[PDB]
Amino acid sequence: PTINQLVRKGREKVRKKSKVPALKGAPFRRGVCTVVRTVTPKKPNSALRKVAKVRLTSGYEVTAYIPGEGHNLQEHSVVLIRGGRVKDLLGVRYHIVRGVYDAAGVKDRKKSRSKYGTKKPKEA
Amino acid sequence: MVKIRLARFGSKHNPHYRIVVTDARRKRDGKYIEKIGYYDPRKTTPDWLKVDVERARYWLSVGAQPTDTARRLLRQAGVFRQE
C-alpha cells in the first residue's frame, strides 16, 4: 500500500482470542462436579476417557479431563480446574488437578508424581 | 518554609543521607529542590561528609532552615564559621 495509504489507514494490530475462559485469566478455578462421565474420543483412537462437567466459581459450566490411572471423583466433588485441552476429545478445554480439594493423587505412582499429585513413598 | 535536611538513601542498616534543600511539607525521601551534600554516619569511607558551602550559604541567605542535625553537619563543614 502506498505510503500515503499507510498514513491514511495504517496497519491493524492483531488481537488474540483466549483459549480459556477460566474468566479473569486465573491460573486455576474452583468448581463442583455436575456429571462424572466417560466419553469416547475421535477417529484414530479408541478409549473410555474420563471426564467431569463442572459448575465453576466464574459462573461457567465447562468440561474437564480427569488425568491419571484412576479417580475418586463423582457427583458433588469440589475440584480445581487448570486449563489445557485434550486433543482427541471435542470440547474439553481444561484439566482437573489431582491432589487438590476432593480429587486425590494417583495411587501407587512412582514416576513423575507432581503431575498427578501424589507424594513421595518411603523406600522399603 | 524551605528547609535544609536529611533524606534517607542507602539500604537497610546502610543509612546514607543526602543533605538536601526542600519544602518542609514534602515527604523526606520525595522530590527535593537541590542536593547540597551527603552524609554517611557509619563513616565507612574516608569522606563520610561533603557539603557545598557556597550553595548552603545561598539557601541560608534566602531563608532555608536547617534541621539541628543538618545544622550540625553544615557547621562541621564550616558553613557557619565567619573568620
Binding site: 505510503i3 500515503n4 498514513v7 | -
Partner: protein, 104 residues
C-alpha cells in the same frame, strides 16, 4: 515566548472575532512522510479591521472568551481567496458524507 502563528481568515461572521485557519507540517512519526494538518483558532479582532482572505499573525493572549486565546498581531498579506475557497469546498463536501449524496 507567547506563541505566534500564521493563518488565513476564513470567517467574518462574529462580532470582534475572526476565525484563523492555520496549517502545520511534520514527518509522520512512523511512516516518515511529511503530512500537513491544520487547525482553526478564534482570534480577537477588536477594531474589526481583518477581512476574509487576510493572512495574519495570531499571538497567544490572555483569555478573551471561552475558546478565544489569541489576538491578531499583524496583517501579513491581504486577500487570498483561494485558501478560503479551499476551506469552503471542503466544508461543502460534507454535504454528502452520510446517508446519500448530492453533486461532487
Amino acid at each position: 515566548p507567547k506563541k505566534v502563528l500564521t493563518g488565513v481568515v476564513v470567517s467574518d461572521k462574529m462580532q470582534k472575532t475572526v476565525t484563523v485557519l492555520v496549517e502545520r507540517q511534520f514527518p509522520h512519526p512512523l511512516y516518515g512522510k511529511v503530512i500537513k494538518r491544520s487547525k482553526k483558532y478564534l482570534a480577537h479582532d477588536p477594531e474589526e479591521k481583518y477581512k476574509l482572505g487576510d493572512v495574519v499573525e495570531i499571538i497567544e493572549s490572555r483569555p478573551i472568551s471561552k475558546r478565544k486565546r489569541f489576538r491578531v498581531l499583524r496583517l501579513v498579506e491581504s486577500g487570498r481567496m483561494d485558501l478560503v475557497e479551499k476551506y469552503l469546498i471542503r466544508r461543502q463536501n460534507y454535504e454528502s458524507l452520510s446517508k446519500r449524496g448530492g453533486k461532487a
